[PDB]
Scaffold this active site. Structure first.
Site, PDB file in Angstrom:
ATOM      1  N   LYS A   7       0.840  -1.196   0.000  1.00 56.59           N
ATOM      2  CA  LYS A   7       0.000   0.000   0.000  1.00 56.59           C
ATOM      3  C   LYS A   7       0.879   1.252   0.000  1.00 56.59           C
ATOM      4  O   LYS A   7       0.638   2.185  -0.761  1.00 56.59           O
ATOM      5  CB  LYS A   7      -0.946  -0.005   1.199  1.00 56.59           C
ATOM      6  CG  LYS A   7      -1.895   1.183   1.241  1.00 56.59           C
ATOM      7  CD  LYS A   7      -2.762   1.126   2.468  1.00 56.59           C
ATOM      8  CE  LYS A   7      -3.776   2.240   2.467  1.00 56.59           C
ATOM      9  NZ  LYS A   7      -4.850   1.988   3.467  1.00 56.59           N
ATOM     10  N   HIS A  12       2.865   5.921  -2.516  1.00 55.89           N
ATOM     11  CA  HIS A  12       3.973   6.854  -2.286  1.00 55.89           C
ATOM     12  C   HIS A  12       5.233   6.685  -3.132  1.00 55.89           C
ATOM     13  O   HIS A  12       6.124   7.524  -3.048  1.00 55.89           O
ATOM     14  CB  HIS A  12       4.344   6.917  -0.794  1.00 55.89           C
ATOM     15  CG  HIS A  12       3.221   7.371   0.083  1.00 55.89           C
ATOM     16  ND1 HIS A  12       2.663   8.628  -0.016  1.00 55.89           N
ATOM     17  CD2 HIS A  12       2.544   6.737   1.072  1.00 55.89           C
ATOM     18  CE1 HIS A  12       1.699   8.752   0.880  1.00 55.89           C
ATOM     19  NE2 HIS A  12       1.605   7.614   1.550  1.00 55.89           N
ATOM     20  N   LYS A  41      -8.239  12.261  -1.997  1.00 59.76           N
ATOM     21  CA  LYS A  41      -7.245  12.294  -0.920  1.00 59.76           C
ATOM     22  C   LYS A  41      -6.627  13.694  -0.956  1.00 59.76           C
ATOM     23  O   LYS A  41      -6.145  14.120  -1.998  1.00 59.76           O
ATOM     24  CB  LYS A  41      -6.172  11.213  -1.081  1.00 59.76           C
ATOM     25  CG  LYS A  41      -5.147  11.229   0.047  1.00 59.76           C
ATOM     26  CD  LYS A  41      -4.240  10.014   0.019  1.00 59.76           C
ATOM     27  CE  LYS A  41      -3.226  10.088   1.172  1.00 59.76           C
ATOM     28  NZ  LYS A  41      -2.254   8.960   1.157  1.00 59.76           N
ATOM     29  N   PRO A  42      -6.689  14.430   0.164  1.00 57.73           N
ATOM     30  CA  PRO A  42      -6.305  15.848   0.172  1.00 57.73           C
ATOM     31  C   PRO A  42      -4.818  16.131  -0.091  1.00 57.73           C
ATOM     32  O   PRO A  42      -4.490  17.068  -0.820  1.00 57.73           O
ATOM     33  CB  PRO A  42      -6.715  16.315   1.577  1.00 57.73           C
ATOM     34  CG  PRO A  42      -7.666  15.266   2.073  1.00 57.73           C
ATOM     35  CD  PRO A  42      -7.188  13.993   1.480  1.00 57.73           C
ATOM     36  N   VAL A  43      -3.930  15.333   0.498  1.00 60.22           N
ATOM     37  CA  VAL A  43      -2.485  15.543   0.362  1.00 60.22           C
ATOM     38  C   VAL A  43      -1.799  14.193   0.212  1.00 60.22           C
ATOM     39  O   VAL A  43      -2.063  13.263   0.982  1.00 60.22           O
ATOM     40  CB  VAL A  43      -1.877  16.304   1.584  1.00 60.22           C
ATOM     41  CG1 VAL A  43      -0.357  16.391   1.481  1.00 60.22           C
ATOM     42  CG2 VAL A  43      -2.472  17.712   1.710  1.00 60.22           C
ATOM     43  N   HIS A 119       4.007   4.040   6.134  1.00 62.12           N
ATOM     44  CA  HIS A 119       3.308   5.342   6.046  1.00 62.12           C
ATOM     45  C   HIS A 119       4.290   6.438   5.698  1.00 62.12           C
ATOM     46  O   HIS A 119       5.465   6.386   6.086  1.00 62.12           O
ATOM     47  CB  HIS A 119       2.610   5.725   7.351  1.00 62.12           C
ATOM     48  CG  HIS A 119       1.651   4.701   7.869  1.00 62.12           C
ATOM     49  ND1 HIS A 119       0.520   4.187   7.331  1.00 62.12           N
ATOM     50  CD2 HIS A 119       1.808   4.089   9.094  1.00 62.12           C
ATOM     51  CE1 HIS A 119       0.028   3.267   8.225  1.00 62.12           C
ATOM     52  NE2 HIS A 119       0.819   3.232   9.283  1.00 62.12           N
ATOM     53  N   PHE A 120       3.805   7.433   4.958  1.00 62.58           N
ATOM     54  CA  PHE A 120       4.595   8.625   4.704  1.00 62.58           C
ATOM     55  C   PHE A 120       4.161   9.697   5.692  1.00 62.58           C
ATOM     56  O   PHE A 120       3.014  10.132   5.669  1.00 62.58           O
ATOM     57  CB  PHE A 120       4.402   9.096   3.259  1.00 62.58           C
ATOM     58  CG  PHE A 120       5.359  10.175   2.854  1.00 62.58           C
ATOM     59  CD1 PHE A 120       6.514   9.859   2.139  1.00 62.58           C
ATOM     60  CD2 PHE A 120       5.114  11.505   3.202  1.00 62.58           C
ATOM     61  CE1 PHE A 120       7.412  10.859   1.782  1.00 62.58           C
ATOM     62  CE2 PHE A 120       6.001  12.508   2.848  1.00 62.58           C
ATOM     63  CZ  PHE A 120       7.157  12.178   2.123  1.00 62.58           C
ATOM     64  N   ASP A 121       5.079  10.128   6.556  1.00 57.30           N
ATOM     65  CA  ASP A 121       4.697  11.065   7.623  1.00 57.30           C
ATOM     66  C   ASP A 121       4.828  12.546   7.258  1.00 57.30           C
ATOM     67  O   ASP A 121       3.945  13.358   7.579  1.00 57.30           O
ATOM     68  CB  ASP A 121       5.479  10.762   8.908  1.00 57.30           C
ATOM     69  CG  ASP A 121       4.731  11.186  10.160  1.00 57.30           C
ATOM     70  OD1 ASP A 121       3.527  10.859  10.274  1.00 57.30           O
ATOM     71  OD2 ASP A 121       5.343  11.839  11.033  1.00 57.30           O
TER      72      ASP A 121
HETATM   73  O1  LIG Z   1       3.839  15.454   3.378  1.00 58.70           O
HETATM   74  C1  LIG Z   1       2.899  14.669   3.471  1.00 58.70           C
HETATM   75  C2  LIG Z   1       2.026  14.712   4.557  1.00 58.70           C
HETATM   76  C3  LIG Z   1       0.960  13.808   4.598  1.00 58.70           C
HETATM   77  N1  LIG Z   1       0.760  12.845   3.572  1.00 58.70           N
HETATM   78  C4  LIG Z   1      -0.392  11.879   3.615  1.00 58.70           C
HETATM   79  O2  LIG Z   1      -1.356  12.319   4.617  1.00 58.70           O
HETATM   80  C5  LIG Z   1      -0.919  11.579   5.816  1.00 58.70           C
HETATM   81  C6  LIG Z   1      -1.737  11.593   7.119  1.00 58.70           C
HETATM   82  N2  LIG Z   1      -2.765  12.632   7.113  1.00 58.70           N
HETATM   83  C7  LIG Z   1      -2.633  13.380   8.375  1.00 58.70           C
HETATM   84  C8  LIG Z   1      -3.855  14.288   8.594  1.00 58.70           C
HETATM   85  O3  LIG Z   1      -5.049  13.482   8.518  1.00 58.70           O
HETATM   86  C9  LIG Z   1      -5.212  12.905   7.203  1.00 58.70           C
HETATM   87  C10 LIG Z   1      -4.053  11.925   6.993  1.00 58.70           C
HETATM   88  C11 LIG Z   1      -0.874  10.186   5.241  1.00 58.70           C
HETATM   89  O4  LIG Z   1      -0.245   9.215   6.071  1.00 58.70           O
HETATM   90  C12 LIG Z   1      -0.006  10.437   4.031  1.00 58.70           C
HETATM   91  O5  LIG Z   1      -0.494   9.489   3.103  1.00 58.70           O
HETATM   92  C13 LIG Z   1       1.629  12.828   2.481  1.00 58.70           C
HETATM   93  O6  LIG Z   1       1.514  12.007   1.570  1.00 58.70           O
HETATM   94  N3  LIG Z   1       2.680  13.743   2.446  1.00 58.70           N
END
Ligand SMILES: O=c1ccn([C@@H]2O[C@@H](CN3CCOCC3)[C@H](O)[C@H]2O)c(=O)[nH]1
Length: 124
Positions: A7, A12, A41-43, A119-121
């Site tokens: 995933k 990523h 997906k927002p970001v 996960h990407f943080d």
């Molecule tokens: O610089 C980034 C930062 C985040 N992500 C994404 O958002 C992260 C977590 N979010 C935190 C806020 O609630 C929604 C989910 C996901 O783990 C990651 O997929 C980035 O891809 N690149």
């Protein structure tokens, strides 16, 4: 199904492009990687380094995760990345994104055996 490691790779990793992400890139990639199926997906960040190099981050600088867990790791070197950020006028199912290239240290959460990114943080 899909493992957590897989995933992470789907969400990523984009090793196939060095750093030439067009203005269309996020629009195409967010869709093709199935990140726009249930919602926009927002970001989301894509990393343009080898899988081996990104996996290696799990042995690098241990840092606190944003959620307070302790299994995050920051790359010692900067990496080529593309950030995708949903536009203000983006409306599902027609998710629209700004594509921005950067060279930054990545922070990933690692789990499992083998110990790999799940996960990407953040990027810093
Ligand atoms: O610089 C980034 C930062 C985040 N992500 C994404 O958002 C992260 C977590 N979010 C935190 C806020 O609630 C929604 C989910 C996901 O783990 C990651 O997929 C980035 O891809 N690149």
């Amino acid at each position: 199904k899909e493992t957590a490691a897989a995933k992470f790779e789907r969400q990523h990793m984009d090793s196939s492009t060095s750093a030439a992400s067009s203005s269309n890139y996020c629009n195409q990639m967010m869709k093709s990687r199935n990140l726009t199926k249930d919602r926009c997906k927002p970001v989301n960040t894509f990393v343009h380094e080898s899988l081996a190099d990104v996996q290696a981050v799990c042995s690098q600088k241990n840092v606190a995760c944003k959620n307070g867990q302790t299994n995050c790791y920051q790359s010692y070197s900067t990496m080529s990345i593309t950030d995708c950020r949903e536009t203000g006028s983006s409306k599902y199912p027609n998710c629209a994104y700004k594509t921005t290239q950067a060279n930054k240290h990545i922070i990933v959460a690692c789990e499992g055996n083998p110990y790999v990114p799940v996960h990407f943080d953040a990027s810093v």
